[PDB]
Amino acid sequence: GGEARPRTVWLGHPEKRDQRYPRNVINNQKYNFFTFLPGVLFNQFKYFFNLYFLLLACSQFVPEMRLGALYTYWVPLGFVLAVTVIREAVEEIRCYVRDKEVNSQVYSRLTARGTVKVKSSNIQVGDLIIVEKNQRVPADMIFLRTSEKNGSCFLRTDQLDGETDWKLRLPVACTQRLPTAADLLQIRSYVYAEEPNIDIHNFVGTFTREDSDPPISESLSIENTLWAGTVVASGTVVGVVLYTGRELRSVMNTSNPRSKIGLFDLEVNCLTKILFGALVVVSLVMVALQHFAGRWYLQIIRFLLLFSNIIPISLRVNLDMGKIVYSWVIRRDSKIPGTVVRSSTIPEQLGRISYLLTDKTGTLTQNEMIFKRLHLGTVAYGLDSMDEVQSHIFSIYTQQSQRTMSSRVHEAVKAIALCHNVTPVYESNGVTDQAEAEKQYEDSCRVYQASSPDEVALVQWTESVGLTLVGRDQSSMQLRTPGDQILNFTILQIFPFTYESKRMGIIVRDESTGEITFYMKGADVVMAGIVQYNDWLEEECGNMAREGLRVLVVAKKSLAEEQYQDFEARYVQAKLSVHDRSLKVATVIESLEMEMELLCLTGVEDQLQADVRPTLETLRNAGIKVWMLTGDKLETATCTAKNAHLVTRNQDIHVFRLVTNRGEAHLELNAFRRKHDCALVISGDSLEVCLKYYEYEFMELACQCPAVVCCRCAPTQKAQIVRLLQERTGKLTCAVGDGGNDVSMIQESDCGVGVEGKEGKQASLAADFSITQFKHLGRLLMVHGRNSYKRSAALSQFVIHRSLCISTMQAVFSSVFYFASVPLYQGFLIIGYSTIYTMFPVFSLVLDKDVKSEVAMLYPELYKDLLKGRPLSYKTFLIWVLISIYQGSTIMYGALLLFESEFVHIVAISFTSLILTELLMVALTIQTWHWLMTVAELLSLACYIASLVFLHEFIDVYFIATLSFLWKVSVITLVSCLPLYVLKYLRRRFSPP
Ligand SMILES: CC(C)CCC[C@@H](C)[C@H]1CC[C@H]2[C@@H]3CC=C4C[C@@H](O)CC[C@]4(C)[C@H]3CC[C@]12C
Ligand SMILES: [Mg+2]
């Protein structure tokens, strides 16, 4: 609408504004009230197929042009227009209703008279909206105040950038210290926010409070921002709205909704142009035959109007009803429940997808992490062997009051239970207060919260074996044992996990003994040299990683009361430095990071969704290349790629390093080129450089890959990847996602599928097809797409064949029977009127199937045939053209040569022969017979016999009730259809499908 400018947002009072802000509404609609009709009309009549009808109809306005009745040109086109408008309108009402659930969420705001309850749509910039726990943040906000005593909160941004880690967000310091939540309305404070941009992980702002005698100014960053679409993980937060509606950071990354057309529709449109060009060519030949006879422009276009039915409106009507039937079938399948079809005009696109691009967090995975393996070197403990770890812990803490394997197991478990950054949170269950449960350490009211879900999984696992961690402070940590006694540990040093070191350490003192213990856990690559000599770390960690687990190496070092003093004195000496602090403390910690005894290796798995591995294997077996485009980190993405068998166990993986320029990109691209049959894992930062500088080479190397993993992808980068896959290959692409970061690539893709997320519905609402589970994709692609594509191709080709046969024989009639007469047009309106009796058996091809639904799924290789364009091609169309020409020529020439008396004794023969030939041809193309096709074929014959009976009494047509009629009809019906019967049977025999 307007240029982006920084905004001064006053806390409360949503009226001190200079620019009007958009309403906070998420809209997936295509058109508004005003632009609905023009948009639909243009999107319909922008193609040759639909514009042909308009060109035909408009000509009826020139008096020297008029041919036929006026109501025959506009009633069918009017029906087509009215069905298209109705379909689009109903789609719009359904989209608006589906958007209402998100746009009508209930929240609360702070007013001078007290809190009041308002909806999500009415949220204005500058409003103080209260967001509770496990509630989606409605609009972009600034963290002001939280009800938690530690002055912070955790955010789940899985629906914003697809990252599984929880984001720790800190409130505004000035607003946090106010005595009550009602105090922010009596302070003259404002937030100066940057212009709404597409970046989601950055924010530059400033908080200013003018009320205080010393003005207080805070510099705001991403750590104070609660973007829309995120979920508050803990506590009740209060924020000030900065952006609304389109201005939301989620919406800037969302493209405008577009109307999609399938490739099958484009091929049919090209066939219509070919037909019209052939008509024009024969027109130029026919006029040039007479060496120009004056007013040629009149006669040639009059003859065009005479053959105007070579492109039938029945084609468009049949395709529309077939697509409606396909959508009705998809919405009613019980083996893929919950499937929703939004774009009901492209069900045939599911049958020609060559590339599938999917999100990891929430689509492939369940967004749940649990502990899988505890490897102690000499023995591993799986999910079925945890009762021995529990037994060892119980035995030790029973023998405490009443080396060995139990001691080693306990030492390995306690290190996991202490070397972490997880803090318990206690809530009031309703009977016991929050302060009531803390002093007794209630199990039902205790929740573990941390930035890394792996640490939460480890803590929850140690809870299961007996060592329950019940409290944690900045200098203390309590563990609860099976003997119900509590051990008190004092946290003397903590080294938080960093993505560069890839390790986390801690130093604790056991108050019962006083011994100093140093714990360190991290990746195997960094802990290979820290731990002492061993012979199983590099092998067992590699095996556990190859199984798809997140391996960690846990180590120990017992510190005496003398090795700690010199370490503390040097650590603080490094800390109170004014020159190169980081490298100073790094050396102090590294000096302690020596000769650590190895305890155990841990395996934590991100729980996939149901039937993800079989679905990926099914899609791989059908020639579909599956790329995982995720916004998560490299390690989690690789672990999920290995877990889901997106890469085979023996497959080699090349990790794309961090490249920053053109020269650095040449070397890495070439080095990857020297590899063979190796999957590619690339970060977003390297992808940006490769796509900016090496657009051709990167994709010519990535399309040959068995699979491609691209982590930390911005939504624009995902959409760009989809766009290049569409452009440089020319093959259809499918995009699967569950969050708001997948909407861009879902809309960009030729067929976008949106998995309904657990905490968000944007991808579901903005996709052509919405599924509840990832495993439904296999059926949706192998059955509901293949059947729709095949049925649409068959019915379109049969309709074209019928019209071509009618036109060919009716051209023979007008040429070799009279060559000039008014009574020609009475016959030249009726022998093309047969399509009232054969219309039902033509609308019975939407019930046809080549193989059973359980056979396409069990043999996905049938899809590789559709990937080649078999159902509709130039060879099949040419064969149908030859068949139609042969049938028309045979019917008319045989009718004329066998017997020739006058017009009304040949019209009857030709009409019945054409109807019977078309019915037989309908019966010819069927592969598996359905009873509705049988009833349609029988009802057609019954109606034709009824018509030939009623007219017999009124019109003297006694020719029908003779023997000379029967053999004359049945010889043409035998020489027109049955030669193709023989050909089809011999095709079955010699070349089975
Ligand atoms: C008079 C003609 C042109 C039209 C009406 C007859 C048609 C609809 C009839 C005649 C013979 C019939 C077939 C005869 C036998 C079987 C085997 C069984 O699995 C049921 C379907 C199937 C395959 C029938 C399908 C319908 C069928 C093809
Ligand atoms: Mg996701």
Short mmCIF file of N, CA, C and O in Angstrom, two decimals, residues 307 801-816 831 880-898 906 909-910 913-914 917-918 971-973 975-977 979-980:
data_model
loop_
_atom_site.label_atom_id
_atom_site.label_comp_id
_atom_site.label_asym_id
_atom_site.label_seq_id
_atom_site.Cartn_x
_atom_site.Cartn_y
_atom_site.Cartn_z
N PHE A 307 -19.12 -25.45 -39.02
CA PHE A 307 -18.32 -26.47 -38.34
C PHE A 307 -17.87 -26.02 -36.96
O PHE A 307 -16.85 -26.49 -36.45
N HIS A 801 -13.17 -37.18 -29.75
CA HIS A 801 -13.38 -38.19 -30.78
C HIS A 801 -14.81 -38.17 -31.30
O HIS A 801 -15.04 -38.26 -32.51
N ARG A 802 -15.78 -38.08 -30.39
CA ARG A 802 -17.18 -38.04 -30.80
C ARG A 802 -17.46 -36.84 -31.68
O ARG A 802 -18.10 -36.96 -32.74
N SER A 803 -16.98 -35.66 -31.27
CA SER A 803 -17.22 -34.46 -32.07
C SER A 803 -16.52 -34.53 -33.42
O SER A 803 -17.08 -34.10 -34.43
N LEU A 804 -15.30 -35.07 -33.46
CA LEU A 804 -14.59 -35.21 -34.72
C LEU A 804 -15.30 -36.17 -35.66
O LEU A 804 -15.39 -35.91 -36.87
N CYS A 805 -15.81 -37.29 -35.14
CA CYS A 805 -16.55 -38.22 -35.98
C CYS A 805 -17.81 -37.58 -36.54
O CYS A 805 -18.11 -37.70 -37.74
N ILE A 806 -18.56 -36.87 -35.69
CA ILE A 806 -19.76 -36.19 -36.15
C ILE A 806 -19.42 -35.19 -37.24
O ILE A 806 -20.06 -35.17 -38.30
N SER A 807 -18.40 -34.37 -37.02
CA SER A 807 -18.03 -33.35 -38.00
C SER A 807 -17.59 -33.98 -39.31
O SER A 807 -17.95 -33.50 -40.39
N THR A 808 -16.81 -35.06 -39.24
CA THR A 808 -16.32 -35.69 -40.47
C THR A 808 -17.46 -36.26 -41.30
O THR A 808 -17.55 -36.01 -42.51
N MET A 809 -18.36 -37.01 -40.67
CA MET A 809 -19.40 -37.64 -41.48
C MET A 809 -20.42 -36.60 -41.94
O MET A 809 -20.98 -36.72 -43.03
N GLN A 810 -20.66 -35.57 -41.13
CA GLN A 810 -21.55 -34.49 -41.51
C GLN A 810 -20.95 -33.56 -42.56
O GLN A 810 -21.68 -32.83 -43.23
N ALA A 811 -19.62 -33.57 -42.71
CA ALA A 811 -19.00 -32.94 -43.86
C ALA A 811 -19.16 -33.78 -45.11
O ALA A 811 -19.36 -33.24 -46.20
N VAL A 812 -19.06 -35.11 -44.97
CA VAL A 812 -19.34 -35.98 -46.11
C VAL A 812 -20.78 -35.79 -46.59
O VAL A 812 -21.05 -35.73 -47.79
N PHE A 813 -21.72 -35.69 -45.64
CA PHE A 813 -23.13 -35.50 -45.99
C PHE A 813 -23.36 -34.23 -46.79
O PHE A 813 -24.05 -34.26 -47.82
N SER A 814 -22.82 -33.11 -46.34
CA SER A 814 -23.04 -31.83 -46.99
C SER A 814 -22.29 -31.70 -48.31
O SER A 814 -22.52 -30.73 -49.04
N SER A 815 -21.40 -32.64 -48.63
CA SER A 815 -20.57 -32.56 -49.82
C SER A 815 -21.00 -33.53 -50.91
O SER A 815 -21.05 -33.15 -52.09
N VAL A 816 -21.31 -34.78 -50.56
CA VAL A 816 -21.52 -35.82 -51.56
C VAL A 816 -22.98 -36.23 -51.68
O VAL A 816 -23.29 -37.24 -52.33
N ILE A 831 -27.95 -34.53 -37.13
CA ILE A 831 -26.99 -35.63 -37.13
C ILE A 831 -25.83 -35.27 -36.21
O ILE A 831 -24.94 -36.08 -35.95
N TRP A 880 -6.88 -41.31 -32.00
CA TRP A 880 -8.29 -40.99 -31.86
C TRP A 880 -8.81 -40.20 -33.06
O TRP A 880 -9.95 -40.40 -33.50
N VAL A 881 -7.99 -39.30 -33.61
CA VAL A 881 -8.38 -38.53 -34.78
C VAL A 881 -8.61 -39.46 -35.97
O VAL A 881 -9.62 -39.35 -36.68
N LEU A 882 -7.68 -40.39 -36.20
CA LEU A 882 -7.83 -41.34 -37.30
C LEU A 882 -9.06 -42.22 -37.09
O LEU A 882 -9.80 -42.49 -38.04
N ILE A 883 -9.29 -42.66 -35.86
CA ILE A 883 -10.46 -43.49 -35.57
C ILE A 883 -11.74 -42.72 -35.87
O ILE A 883 -12.67 -43.25 -36.49
N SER A 884 -11.81 -41.46 -35.45
CA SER A 884 -13.01 -40.66 -35.67
C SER A 884 -13.25 -40.42 -37.15
O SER A 884 -14.39 -40.53 -37.63
N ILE A 885 -12.20 -40.08 -37.89
CA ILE A 885 -12.35 -39.85 -39.33
C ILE A 885 -12.80 -41.13 -40.02
O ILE A 885 -13.70 -41.11 -40.87
N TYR A 886 -12.18 -42.27 -39.67
CA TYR A 886 -12.58 -43.53 -40.27
C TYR A 886 -14.03 -43.87 -39.95
O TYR A 886 -14.78 -44.30 -40.83
N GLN A 887 -14.45 -43.67 -38.70
CA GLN A 887 -15.82 -44.00 -38.32
C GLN A 887 -16.82 -43.13 -39.07
O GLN A 887 -17.81 -43.63 -39.60
N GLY A 888 -16.57 -41.82 -39.13
CA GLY A 888 -17.49 -40.95 -39.84
C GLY A 888 -17.56 -41.25 -41.33
O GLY A 888 -18.66 -41.37 -41.90
N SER A 889 -16.40 -41.41 -41.97
CA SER A 889 -16.38 -41.72 -43.39
C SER A 889 -17.06 -43.05 -43.67
O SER A 889 -17.87 -43.15 -44.60
N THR A 890 -16.77 -44.07 -42.86
CA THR A 890 -17.39 -45.37 -43.05
C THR A 890 -18.90 -45.28 -42.90
O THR A 890 -19.64 -45.75 -43.77
N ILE A 891 -19.38 -44.66 -41.82
CA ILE A 891 -20.82 -44.59 -41.61
C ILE A 891 -21.51 -43.90 -42.78
O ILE A 891 -22.43 -44.45 -43.39
N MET A 892 -21.03 -42.71 -43.17
CA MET A 892 -21.76 -41.98 -44.19
C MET A 892 -21.62 -42.60 -45.57
O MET A 892 -22.62 -42.74 -46.29
N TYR A 893 -20.41 -42.99 -45.96
CA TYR A 893 -20.21 -43.59 -47.28
C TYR A 893 -20.96 -44.91 -47.40
O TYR A 893 -21.58 -45.18 -48.43
N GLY A 894 -20.90 -45.77 -46.37
CA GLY A 894 -21.64 -47.01 -46.42
C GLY A 894 -23.14 -46.79 -46.47
O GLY A 894 -23.84 -47.47 -47.23
N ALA A 895 -23.65 -45.84 -45.68
CA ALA A 895 -25.08 -45.54 -45.74
C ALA A 895 -25.50 -45.08 -47.13
O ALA A 895 -26.53 -45.54 -47.64
N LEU A 896 -24.72 -44.21 -47.76
CA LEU A 896 -25.07 -43.73 -49.09
C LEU A 896 -24.93 -44.81 -50.16
O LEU A 896 -25.80 -44.89 -51.04
N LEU A 897 -23.88 -45.62 -50.13
CA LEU A 897 -23.66 -46.62 -51.17
C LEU A 897 -24.60 -47.81 -51.06
O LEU A 897 -25.03 -48.35 -52.08
N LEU A 898 -24.91 -48.25 -49.84
CA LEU A 898 -25.78 -49.42 -49.68
C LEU A 898 -27.18 -49.15 -50.22
O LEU A 898 -27.79 -50.02 -50.84
N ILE A 906 -32.38 -41.94 -45.25
CA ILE A 906 -30.96 -42.09 -44.97
C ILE A 906 -30.59 -41.42 -43.65
O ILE A 906 -29.65 -41.85 -42.97
N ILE A 909 -31.04 -44.04 -40.89
CA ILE A 909 -29.96 -45.02 -40.87
C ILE A 909 -28.69 -44.43 -40.28
O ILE A 909 -28.06 -45.03 -39.40
N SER A 910 -28.31 -43.23 -40.73
CA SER A 910 -27.08 -42.62 -40.24
C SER A 910 -27.16 -42.33 -38.74
O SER A 910 -26.19 -42.57 -38.01
N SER A 913 -27.00 -45.65 -36.72
CA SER A 913 -25.66 -46.20 -36.83
C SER A 913 -24.65 -45.43 -35.99
O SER A 913 -23.83 -46.05 -35.31
N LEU A 914 -24.72 -44.10 -36.00
CA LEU A 914 -23.83 -43.30 -35.17
C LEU A 914 -24.05 -43.54 -33.68
O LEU A 914 -23.08 -43.67 -32.93
N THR A 917 -22.68 -47.01 -32.82
CA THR A 917 -21.22 -47.00 -32.87
C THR A 917 -20.64 -46.30 -31.65
O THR A 917 -19.66 -46.78 -31.07
N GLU A 918 -21.23 -45.18 -31.25
CA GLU A 918 -20.71 -44.47 -30.08
C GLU A 918 -20.90 -45.28 -28.81
O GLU A 918 -20.01 -45.29 -27.94
N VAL A 971 -24.59 -53.81 -40.48
CA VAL A 971 -23.35 -53.96 -41.25
C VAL A 971 -22.44 -52.76 -41.07
O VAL A 971 -21.22 -52.93 -40.92
N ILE A 972 -22.99 -51.55 -41.04
CA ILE A 972 -22.19 -50.35 -40.81
C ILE A 972 -21.72 -50.33 -39.36
O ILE A 972 -20.56 -49.98 -39.09
N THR A 973 -22.59 -50.71 -38.43
CA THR A 973 -22.17 -50.78 -37.03
C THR A 973 -21.13 -51.86 -36.78
O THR A 973 -20.36 -51.75 -35.82
N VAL A 975 -18.81 -52.76 -39.30
CA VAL A 975 -17.58 -52.36 -39.99
C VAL A 975 -17.00 -51.06 -39.44
O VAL A 975 -15.87 -50.71 -39.79
N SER A 976 -17.74 -50.35 -38.59
CA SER A 976 -17.25 -49.13 -37.97
C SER A 976 -16.56 -49.35 -36.64
O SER A 976 -15.54 -48.72 -36.35
N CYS A 977 -17.10 -50.23 -35.79
CA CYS A 977 -16.58 -50.42 -34.44
C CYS A 977 -15.71 -51.66 -34.31
O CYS A 977 -14.56 -51.57 -33.86
N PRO A 979 -13.84 -53.59 -36.19
CA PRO A 979 -12.41 -53.60 -36.57
C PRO A 979 -11.51 -53.01 -35.49
O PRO A 979 -10.37 -53.46 -35.34
N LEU A 980 -12.00 -52.03 -34.73
CA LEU A 980 -11.23 -51.53 -33.59
C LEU A 980 -11.33 -52.48 -32.40
O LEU A 980 -10.43 -52.54 -31.56
#
